[PDB]
């Protein structure tokens, strides 16, 4: 559609959190989980409403 376009990649925010490993005791043993959630910008420029 001849649309003037650029792309850039915003830096990612990886929001890791921790949890206990056994069901009972042992706070010296954790397992930690993460979300890698990534980004993308689709910076279009100067296009009509239709």
């Amino acid at each position: 559609l001849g649309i003037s376009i650029k792309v850039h990649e915003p830096p990612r925010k990886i929001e890791r959190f921790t949890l206990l490993q056994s069901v009972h005791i042992y706070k010296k043993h954790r397992v930690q989980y993460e979300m890698r959630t990534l980004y993308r910008c689709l910076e279009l420029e100067h296009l009509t409403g239709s």
Binding site: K13, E15, Q21, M35, R36, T37
Partner: protein, 132 residues
Amino acid sequence: KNRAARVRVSKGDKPVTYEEAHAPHYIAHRKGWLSLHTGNLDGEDHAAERTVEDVFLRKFMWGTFPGCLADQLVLKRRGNQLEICAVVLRQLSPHKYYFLVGYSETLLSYFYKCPVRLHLQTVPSKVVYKYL
């Protein structure tokens, strides 16, 4: 020893699929997630109520496709469109199979309040990645 999602080696005669042969430190390293939705990205809400529906649909269909479900399902989610994909064994008659598509499609359409579409796949035997 940590026993979170492994099956344990016993002999040479125990077959196992690709997924449950893989330990949970391979979740995005060697596996895919079994269900796709827009919940855990930040900051998005509706990550919370969906997964207590996500756990029903693989506890619903474990019972309504009984004895024939090959491995776990794939519960894709496209806007207001819940896309269940499933590979199922070739053991039942197909007249039964076509019954519980439209049974479960319009009973899961009228529970989630969305449309739901099923895509079955037929394999003759359970696909085994490891003779452990």
